[PDB]
Amino acid sequence: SVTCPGGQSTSNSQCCVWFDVLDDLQTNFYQGSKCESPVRKILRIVFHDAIGFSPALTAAGQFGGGGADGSIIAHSNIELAFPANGGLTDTVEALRAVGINHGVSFGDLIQFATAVGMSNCPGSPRLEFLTGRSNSSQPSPPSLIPGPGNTVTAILDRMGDAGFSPDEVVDLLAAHSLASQEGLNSAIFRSPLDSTPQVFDTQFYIETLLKGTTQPGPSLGFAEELSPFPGEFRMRSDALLARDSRTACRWQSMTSSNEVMGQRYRAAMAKMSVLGFDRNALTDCSDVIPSAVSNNAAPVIPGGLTVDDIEVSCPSEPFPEIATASGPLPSLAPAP
Ligand code: HEM
Ligand SMILES: *[C@@H]1O[C@H](CO)[C@@H](O)[C@H](O)[C@H]1NC(C)=O
Ligand SMILES: *[C@@H]1O[C@H](CO)[C@@H](O)[C@H](O)[C@@H]1O
Ligand SMILES: [Ca+2]
Ligand SMILES: [Ca+2]
Ligand SMILES: [Mg+2]
Structure with a gap:
């Protein structure tokens, strides 16, 4: 030394x-x-x-x-x-x-x-x-x-070519836990991708799995899907990756432990x-x-939503037991 x-x-x-x-x-x-x-x-x-x-x-x-x-x-x-x-x-x-x-x-x-x-x-x-x-x-x-409107197959294809397996693609995406968008829908500049844009946690994986019910902006922009609450933006590729058979299980296993998510992401x-x-x-x-x-902080399903609002997509394992926050629905402020 x-x-x-x-x-x-x-x-x-x-x-x-x-x-x-x-x-x-x-x-x-x-x-x-x-x-x-x-x-x-x-x-x-x-x-x-x-x-x-x-x-x-x-x-x-x-x-x-x-x-x-x-x-x-x-x-x-x-x-x-x-x-x-x-x-x-x-x-x-x-x-x-x-x-x-x-x-x-x-x-x-x-x-x-x-x-x-x-x-x-x-x-x-x-x-x-x-x-x-x-x-x-x-x-x-x-x-x-890879772009937000790409098909899961195209995404896994591009990433695979570079050397990443589907599991690793999900691991790399933990970065969206500290994210917002500025160019997909400028009307809602810097709308976060998860409820905690300044905290590297599992909220991204949990929230992208909740049923899409809200349109946060005046219109649904390019590659935008409905999100679970006002102020949150849901990208099309994240939405599909969360539910696709090829990546669903890895996505779900990323919801309950901040420690496991960190380790995987770090390795990827x-x-x-x-x-x-x-x-x-x-x-x-x-x-x-x-x-x-x-x-x-413990991983939580926010705003009075329950596991019944989670669109479970992994067939081999049950959705893990995590905390539930009381209502009402939150409204996310733009990321700083
Ligand atoms: C399947 C692959 C991915 C796709 C299709 C994708 C797509 C996007 C898009 C379109 C945005 C919105 C940018 C904007 O409009 O401002 C975004 C934001 C972001 N992405 Fe990705 N992304 C992917 C993977 C990743 C990975 C692997 C990382 C890095 C390890 C990452 C880190 C970020 C960050 C932190 C932001 C937030 C930028 C900001 O808030 O200014 N993403 N992503
Ligand atoms: C790296 O390359 C750029 C030009 O692309 C140059 O301006 C820079 O000084 C180079 N840096 C080093 C550390 O050699
Ligand atoms: C939720 O409310 C926040 C402020 O608390 C806004 O940023 C968002 O667009 C929605 O109205
Ligand atoms: Ca390069
Ligand atoms: Ca976060
Ligand atoms: Mg309900």
């Missing part, structure tokens, strides 16, 4: 630079270690950056993309033109300057920012952080990012963090990531 200039101990000298980056991101990018829009955006970026990897394209004699190579920043001119990459400009620009001023690769920076961002959100696991990804990259081919994320790379070539700097405060 080594002791960096500032006095912090670490297992590798290549981790030292990150303590400075941590200080920078928390102060400025995160505006005081907060769990607001900046974290959710970075979470969109890390997914959109890494999934630009496709062994099948490579098989068809084409460039399949370099994965988590930081290409979304390096080639933002091309990638930010992608339909799926709307609303990310200001975030890409802010990160570009951080990577430049610290001499760290874009690929590594995006991964670091994700782990650090999540620590500011109660309930989040301590994500793994590897460093050593090259700073060079080619722009990602278009159409490698570690796998996604190295798409396009060989982890044996990277250096482990996980010890730099701070812990997130604990979330002790």
Whole structure:
């Protein structure tokens, strides 16, 4: 182990630079270690950056993309033109300057920012952080990012090609527990995807399974479905994934334990963090990531709804026993 200039101990000298980056991101990018829009955006970026990897394209004699190579920043001119990459400009620009001023690769920076961002959100696991990804990259081919109107088959197909099994697709989606939408229905800008957009918990999995009864906006936008209460937005792909036979059971098993959800997501994320790379070539700097405060709230079916309102879709196991909150129906405020 080594002791960096500032006095912090670490297992590798290549981790030292990150303590400075941590200080920078928390102060400025995160505006005081907060769990607001900046974290959710970075979470969109890390997914959109890494999934630009496709062994099948490579098989068809084409460039399949370099994965988590930081290409979304390096080639933002091309990638930010992608339909799926709307609303990310200001975030890409802010990160570009951080990577430049610290001499760290874009690929590594995006991964670091994700782990650090999540620590500011109660309930989040301590994500793994590897460093050593090259700073060079080619722009990602278009159409490698799954969209909200895609069919479950198409989604599982794209993710499978990248290396994720259906279970892992459900695990990765835990990120929607700290999410809102800004571009699917602008009339309800920043409507949350679950009742706790600042808490990494199982509410997302529970709420997407409740019967859709409400139209939160003046109209139902593109790829929008009815949600269980005012202020909450339900994306079509989440709705289908929650109920599809190929993913239903994993989804349901994610409702009762925050601990299990965290562990699974963390594992899935570690796998996604190295798409396009060989982890044996990277250096482990996980010890730099701070812990997130604990979330002790129990998973609950909100607003007087009961298990009778849950559209059970898994045939092999009963819906688990969880708490029920008293009414009335909540009305979600926009995410910050
Ligand atoms: C089946 C794959 C997925 C689809 C189809 C999908 C689609 C979307 C869409 C359309 C939005 C709304 C963006 C907007 O209009 O502002 C969204 C938001 C979000 N997504 Fe995904 N997503 C998927 C997987 C994931 C994964 C794996 C992550 C990252 C680990 C993630 C993280 C986020 C976050 C945090 C937001 C919130 C952004 C914000 O509040 O500004 N999603 N997702
Ligand atoms: C990474 O590449 C960009 C150009 O894409 C450059 O401006 C930046 O300084 C490079 N960073 C490092 C750490 O080499
Ligand atoms: C529920 O009420 C909230 C405020 O408490 C709104 O944001 C939402 O659109 C709905 O009226
Ligand atoms: Ca990429
Ligand atoms: Ca949540
Ligand atoms: Mg009822």
